[PDB]
Design a protein around this ligand. Structure first.
Ligand SMILES: *[C@@H]1O[C@H](CO)[C@@H](O)[C@H](O)[C@H]1O
Length: 37
């Protein structure tokens, strides 16, 4: 997304498991390193 707050929320959400991806947000955490270095 790289969108504003979209990116931060994406990593932050992965903290609880409430990302926009909805579904196994576990992997959403690493996705951040790949998308947002
Ligand atoms: C997250 O949202 C998707 C689609 O909206 C759904 O398939 C998942 O079950 C849900 O966790």
């Amino acid at each position: 997304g790289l969108g504003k707050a979209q990116c931060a929320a994406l990593w932050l959400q992965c903290a609880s498991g409430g990302t926009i991806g909805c579904g196994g947000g576990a992997v959403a955490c690493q996705n951040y390193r790949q998308f947002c270095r």
